[PDB]
Amino acid sequence: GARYAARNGGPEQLRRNLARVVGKPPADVPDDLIRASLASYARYWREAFRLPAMDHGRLGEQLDVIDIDHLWSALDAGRGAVLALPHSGNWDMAGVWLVQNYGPFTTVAERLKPESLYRRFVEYRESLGFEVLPLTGGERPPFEVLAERLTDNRPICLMAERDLTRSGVQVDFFGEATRMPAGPAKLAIETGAALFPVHCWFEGDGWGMRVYPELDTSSGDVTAITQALADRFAANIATYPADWHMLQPQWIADL
Numbered sequence: 001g002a003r004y005a006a007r008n009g010g011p012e013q014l015r016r017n018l019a020r021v022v023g024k025p026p027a028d029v030p031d032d033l034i035r036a037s038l039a040s041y042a043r044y045w046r047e048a049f050r051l052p053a054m055d056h057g058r059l060g061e062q063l064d065v066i067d068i069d070h071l072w073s074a075l076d077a078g079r080g081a082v083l084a085l086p087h088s089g090n091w092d093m094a095g096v097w098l099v100q101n102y103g104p105f106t107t108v109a110e111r112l113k114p115e116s117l118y119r120r121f122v123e124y125r126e127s128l129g130f131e132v133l134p135l136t137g138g139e140r141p142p143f144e145v146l147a148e149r150l151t152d153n154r155p156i157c158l159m160a161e162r163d164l165t166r167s168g169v170q171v172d173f174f175g176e177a178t179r180m181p182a183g184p185a186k187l188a189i190e191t192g193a194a195l196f197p198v199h200c201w202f203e204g205d206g207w208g209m210r211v212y213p214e215l216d217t218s219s220g221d222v223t224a225i226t227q228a229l230a231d232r233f234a235a236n237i238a239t240y241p242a243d244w245h246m247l248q249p250q251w252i253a254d255l
């Protein structure tokens with residue numbers, strides 16, 4: 001019921017999510033923003049098609065990342081780093097930038113059906129240089145392989161603003177209840193890795209990317225950490241609202 005509806009969407013569900021971003025009823029969401037959001041949504045897929053075929057050496061030299069030194073200094077400190085970002089802009093282009101300026105990083109992939117579809121997504125992201133760990137059905141437990149990368153002073157990247165299963169962390173998101181994955185907060189606690197909020201967007205015909213100051217994981221409270229994670233994502237999504245490709249149900253109430 002809710003698990004099926006939670007993996008559907010389209011322009012109608014997009015309006016309901018952007019309604020929270022702008023703070024207006026669904027019918028009052030600007031028609032120009034919906035068009036910009038669908039246009040941004042189309043661009044990611046248009047780029048995801050040709051991204052494995054482009055000159056990644058060019059992309060790494062010419063694209064920039066705001067406050068990238070936040071990540072370098074944390075890797076210079078031997079701590080590892082957790083990069084948690086929302087589904088905004090082109091994050092596969094951001095990974096390309098990291099593969100060229102640092103090297104391969106690790107991530108997790110939901111085991112989609114059919115398997116052939118899942119196989120294609122692995123190939124796609126592996127052809128970009130990412131390490132893809134199966135969230136289920138794999139050889140090793142995903143949470144524990146990632147923890148090894150973090151204590152090994154390596155970066156992992158997690159799409160970390162949506163997880164509407166029984167195991168999601170409930171947080172406030174534009175004043176309403178949603179659920180986000182616990183992975184990012186739990187991995188910074190258990191391993192001490194630096195937890196950096198990350199945001200990607202479309203800067204004209206280019207790509208905008210930014211690393212934000214790492215969150216305080218001193219409390220060991222997954223909710224308090226994930227809530228600060230939600231606060232940062234909401235602050236960034238509000239700046240580039242059209243570049244947030246959330247056509248799926250996001251908030252608990254819409255299920």
Ligand SMILES: CCCCCCCCCCCCCCCC(=O)O
Pocket residue numbers: 065071083091092094095098107108109110125157158159198209210211
């Ligand atoms: C310094 C900024 C670098 C940001 C690098 C972002 C790379 C993220 C790539 C994520 C690919 C996997 C997306 C879906 C995974 C899932 O289902 O959780």
Ligand SMILES: OC[C@H]1O[C@@H](O)[C@@H](O)[C@@H](O)[C@@H]1O
Pocket residue numbers: 087159
């Ligand atoms: O975050 C997971 C989502 O990532 C997007 O880039 C697409 O590949 C979706 O099919 C997938 O469900």
